[PDB]
Design a protein around this nucleic acid. Structure first.
Ligand SMILES: [Mg+2]
Ligand SMILES: [Mg+2]
Ligand SMILES: [Mg+2]
Ligand SMILES: [Mg+2]
Ligand SMILES: [Mg+2]
Ligand SMILES: [Mg+2]
Ligand SMILES: [Mg+2]
Ligand SMILES: [Mg+2]
Ligand SMILES: [Mg+2]
Ligand SMILES: [Mg+2]
Ligand SMILES: [Mg+2]
Ligand SMILES: [Mg+2]
Ligand SMILES: [Mg+2]
Ligand SMILES: [Mg+2]
Ligand SMILES: [Mg+2]
Ligand SMILES: [Mg+2]
Ligand SMILES: [Mg+2]
Ligand SMILES: [Mg+2]
Ligand SMILES: [Mg+2]
Ligand SMILES: [Mg+2]
Ligand SMILES: [Mg+2]
Ligand SMILES: [Mg+2]
Ligand SMILES: [Mg+2]
Ligand SMILES: [Mg+2]
Ligand SMILES: [Mg+2]
Ligand SMILES: [Mg+2]
Ligand SMILES: [Mg+2]
Ligand SMILES: [Mg+2]
Lengths: 122, 205, 79, 129, 156, 82
RNA sequence: CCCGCAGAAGAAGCACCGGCUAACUCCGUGCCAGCAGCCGCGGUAAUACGGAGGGUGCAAGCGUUAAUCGGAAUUACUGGGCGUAAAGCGCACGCAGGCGGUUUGUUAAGUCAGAUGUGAAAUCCCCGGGCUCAACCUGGGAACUGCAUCUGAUACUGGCAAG
RNA sequence: UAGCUAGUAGGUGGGGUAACGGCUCACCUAGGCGACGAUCCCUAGCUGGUCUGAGAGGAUGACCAGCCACACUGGAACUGA
């Protein structure tokens, strides 16, 4: 606080870590589903939430939520993951992108289609 | 780049009359002006400060036919200019070429005026100007060219205008179909119901 | 009139040469406190006409060694 | 140790005003007397009186107007831990010109406005509101 | 002519053997638009009653403020429990650039051009407390002249 | 050597040349010693379009600066008009 | 760029609608399926999931992700604190360092004032001008808070000398 | 990361450079740097600027313009203004 103290050793800016460090400041990243399974939520919720452990192009092994009803995923399925946590599952920091490399869009969705990789019906 | 939808709908949502139709037939006869738009119109939740500001902004934007990016730009320019920001913004909106033609009276609606401008019917200082956002300057004569001078719509518009209240800041000749933009209008000359201050605050949060 | 600087002779062992601290009383960029900063300069002095602690005025010149590009002009306060 | 006499004097004045003391006394110095003169001229105190020869004591007679202190606030600024010098264009306006800032200039201790008129800056000793 | 507006209404509870007792608190602020402002804090079992109580309280114990041409007289700070507030006069036409509660009290007071910020806590009740204190603790050139025993021209 | 030449500035299809003295090696729009005018070949009527600072040019020529053909033409034009 | 031809003709989507946050209803499911930026929603009447209608906001775009500053006075120079919220070394001595009662003199390093040189052009801003308008281009200013040197003031701080 | 440095720091004289110079060499002196962070480690082209911000700041250095360095990796010189 004393100016002398500050002069000797000035004030350190608070280096804020990322909440998505596997992306490494990329907006998305490709990875291969090592394993796709369901898991139980955290305390005030009941579900079987779909999640996949993915080996990323840059080495990292993350786990990624898979939104939407039903999915065409299995082992050795190249997918793109994006930033975003599921508050709900402990330790899950990434969503898969529906409607990319090896993930289909959700069936019979008429709203938020852009979010679920679904093409416009006619 | 244009709103392509119901006009009385826009008016109903705002609450006020936005003048989107010619005014031959009264809007209360043309629509349920009392009832708000949609399945759930007959309900009035109490509007937050943000909400109220937004509604007024919508009103002015709908009245003139400006999309959001353009409106924001107008606001920025107004703020930059010296003097009062809201007053400046209103002046800019009035200055718009489509608005000027409407004031003069060659278009029944602002939509009509915009269409004419688009279709190259209007010359500013003897040069066919095509842009609706064209800022007219003080002492600028703006006239209908002869090919559009034969337009029955234009003549109809003139009659309607004669019915309407004439602006002090313009001078228009119906036979010549030419008007001189004498000066940018003052706020006292423009309508008092517009609360430009709300717009300024909203774009200053 | 020539540009010249004053400083205390911090050492005088190396022959024909002295080291001259030129304390400057600068202000700190952010905090605004005035801090004493120092600039040691290897100065050439022929005849070794100087003791330690002596205030001495020096001017800049063509480099005389790897590190030595200043020469003294007059010694003052030989104490 | 006493490390700032001007600061001490200002505090003394403030406490006197708080406690409604009529006068406040302290060891006199030339800078202190000058500051006092500025205050008197500007009208924040009624009077000062230096008294003694070997160790003289400055005694200021404080000013009250409606039961409350005239010197509403009075802070030292250029303190020993952090000296403040301003250029004539950077001279502060205290309370939008209502309060004064005693500034030590090349031509002696004077108020901020006077210094500005002259066209010179200096060490800003203190603000008074 | 005594324009008034309610800043915040908040429901608060006490617990009893039975269960919870809910009640509402209404913070209102009234002012004449010429300097006079007064805030009121009413409490009642239902909201309208609370608001009415607040209005009555506010209407009494208002306070006059030396306002200069629809703006502040000098930069003023204000403190209270946590809500520490800064507010600075600004040129005519800037409008009131001020937070929520703060905006209300200033607006009813009749200041049209200020730059405010609420530092510290922003608890409506405290911030209003701070703002009123700050506004009061602000003298005019007439007042300073009176205090120092000078003319206004000597002070400027 | 030092030369006096046009530097291209403006938009696509709307060139505006700044007349600059500069060491010939330097790139067209790069480093230049002094900017001693401008020339606007698309300038309309009731617009000047050209302005050559003649004293500076004279000084540079004296110092030993070669001149671009276009600049020479411009100088001739300025001289005639003026 | 202008002139002529025909004919509304070839040209509207995306997100959102529990609160923050502008915009609400019905059906389907029934702690499942799913949603989520935060707080949360869903266990048989779901304005929070999915569909529909209606509305709101943007619009040839609209959403999501990443990233930086802002809000964040949340590294507090301007502008924070330390009894109990995180925070006073267990207590002392003490070198470097930081600060230094009072008077006079001198110096002029800090400080202040003025001048000269420089601080490239572009950018930012102001008044103009040119592209039908805008973006964009562009004339002239202003600014470039700096740095260096010289000449002054002695208030204060520093040095030296005496008290 | 607390000690680092023997052409190392300075001198005299030769040699070398377009030019000053431990640039190089022979001898002499034992210096020189370092808590105002030397040395060692990690990271990084620099600036006008850009974004943000009331400001002070923070982040940043794509495009445009100035400077530096490199040209498969590592050395070397020749030619030549
Ligand atoms: Mg549960
Ligand atoms: Mg567009
Ligand atoms: Mg803002
Ligand atoms: Mg030609
Ligand atoms: Mg709402
Ligand atoms: Mg259902
Ligand atoms: Mg949703
Ligand atoms: Mg159910
Ligand atoms: Mg919701
Ligand atoms: Mg839904
Ligand atoms: Mg901050
Ligand atoms: Mg704190
Ligand atoms: Mg505890
Ligand atoms: Mg302890
Ligand atoms: Mg203790
Ligand atoms: Mg002293
Ligand atoms: Mg000392
Ligand atoms: Mg000096
Ligand atoms: Mg123009
Ligand atoms: Mg420049
Ligand atoms: Mg002294
Ligand atoms: Mg030699
Ligand atoms: Mg030789
Ligand atoms: Mg690198
Ligand atoms: Mg800020
Ligand atoms: Mg590149
Ligand atoms: Mg090579
Ligand atoms: Mg050769």
């Amino acid at each position: 606080a004393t100016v002398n103290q500050l002069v000797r050793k000035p004030r350190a800016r608070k280096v804020a870590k990322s909440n998505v460090p596997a992306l490494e400041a990329c907006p998305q990243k490709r990875g291969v589903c090592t394993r796709v399974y369901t898991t139980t939520p955290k305390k005030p919720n009941s579900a079987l939430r779909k999640v996949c452990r993915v080996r990323l192009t840059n080495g990292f092994e993350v786990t990624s939520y898979i939104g939407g009803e039903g999915h065409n995923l299995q082992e050795h399925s190249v997918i793109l993951i994006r930033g975003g946590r599921v508050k709900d599952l402990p330790g899950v920091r990434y969503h898969t992108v529906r409607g990319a490399l090896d993930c289909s869009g959700v069936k019979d969705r008429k709203q938020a289609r852009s979010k679920y990789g679904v093409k416009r019906p006619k | 780049a244009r709103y392509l939808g119901p006009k009385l709908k826009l008016s109903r949502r705002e609450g006020t009359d936005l003048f989107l139709k010619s005014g031959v037939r009264a809007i209360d006869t043309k629509c349920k002006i009392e009832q708000a738009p949609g399945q759930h119109g007959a309900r009035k939740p109490r509007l937050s400060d943000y909400g109220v500001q937004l509604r007024e902004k919508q009103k002015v934007r709908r009245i003139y036919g400006v999309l959001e990016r353009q409106f924001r730009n107008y606001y920025k320019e107004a703020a930059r200019l010296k003097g009062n920001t809201g007053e400046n913004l209103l002046a800019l909106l009035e200055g718009r070429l489509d608005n000027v033609v409407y004031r003069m009276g060659f278009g029944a609606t602002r939509a009509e005026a915009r269409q004419l401008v688009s279709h190259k019917a209007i010359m500013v200082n003897g040069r066919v100007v095509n842009i609706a956002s064209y800022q007219v300057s003080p002492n600028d004569v703006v006239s209908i060219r002869e090919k559009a001078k034969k337009q029955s719509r234009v003549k109809a518009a003139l009659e309607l205008a004669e019915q309407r209240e004439k602006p002090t800041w313009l001078e228009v000749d119906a036979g010549k179909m030419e008007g001189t933009f004498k000066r940018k209008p003052e706020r006292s000359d423009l309508s008092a119901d517009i609360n430009e201050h709300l717009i300024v605050e909203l774009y200053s949060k | 009139k020539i540009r010249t600087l004053q400083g205390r002779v911090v050492s005088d062992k190396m022959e024909k040469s002295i080291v001259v601290a030129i304390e400057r009383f600068v202000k700190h960029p952010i905090y605004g406190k005035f801090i004493k900063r120092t600039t040691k300069l290897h100065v050439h002095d022929e005849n070794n006409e100087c003791g330690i602690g002596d205030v001495v005025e020096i001017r800049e010149c063509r480099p005389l060694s790897k590190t030595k590009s200043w020469t003294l002009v007059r010694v003052v306060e030989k104490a | 140790s006493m490390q700032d006499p001007i600061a001490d004097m200002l505090t003394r004045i403030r406490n006197g005003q708080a406690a409604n003391k009529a006068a406040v006394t302290m060891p006199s110095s030339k800078l202190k007397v000058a500051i006092a003169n500025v205050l008197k001229e500007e009208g924040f105190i009624e009077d000062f009186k230096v008294e003694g020869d070997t160790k003289p004591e400055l005694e200021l007679t404080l000013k009250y107007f409606q039961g409350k202190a005239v010197v509403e606030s009075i802070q030292r600024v250029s303190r020993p831990g952090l000296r403040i010098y301003k250029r004539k264009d950077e001279l502060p306006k205290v309370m939008a010109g209502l309060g004064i800032a005693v500034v030590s200039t090349s031509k002696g201790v004077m108020t901020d406005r006077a210094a500005r008129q002259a066209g010179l800056g200096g060490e800003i000793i203190c603000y008074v509101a | 002519e005594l324009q008034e507006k309610l800043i915040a209404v908040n429901r608060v509870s006490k617990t009893v053997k039975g269960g919870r007792i809910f009640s509402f608190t209404a913070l209102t602020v009234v002012g004449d638009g010429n300097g006079r402002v007064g805030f009121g804090y009413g409490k009642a079992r239902e909201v309208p009653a609370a608001i009415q109580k607040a209005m009555e309280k506010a209407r009494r114990n208002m306070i006059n403020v030396a306002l200069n041409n629809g703006t502040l007289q000098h930069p003023v700070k204000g403190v209270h429990t946590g809500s520490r507030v800064f507010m600075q006069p600004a040129s005519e036409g800037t409008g009131i650039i001020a937070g929520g509660a703060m905006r209300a009290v200033l607006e009813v007071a009749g200041v049209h051009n200020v730059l405010a910020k609420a530092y510290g806590s922003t608890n409506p009740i405290n911030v209003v407390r701070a703002t009123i204190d700050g506004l009061e603790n602000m003298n005019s050139p007439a007042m300073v002249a009176a205090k120092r025993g000078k003319s206004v021209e000597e002070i400027l | 050597m030092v030369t006096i030449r046009l530097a291209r500035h403006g938009a696509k299809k709307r060139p505006f040349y700044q007349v600059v003295v500069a060491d010939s090696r330097n790139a067209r729009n790069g480093r230049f010693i002094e900017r001693v005018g401008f020339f606007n070949p698309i300038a309309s009527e009731k617009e000047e379009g050209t302005r050559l600072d003649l004293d500076r040019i004279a000084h540079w020529v004296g110092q030993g600066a070669t001149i671009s053909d276009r600049v020479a033409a411009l100088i001739k034009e300025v001289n005639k008009a003026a």
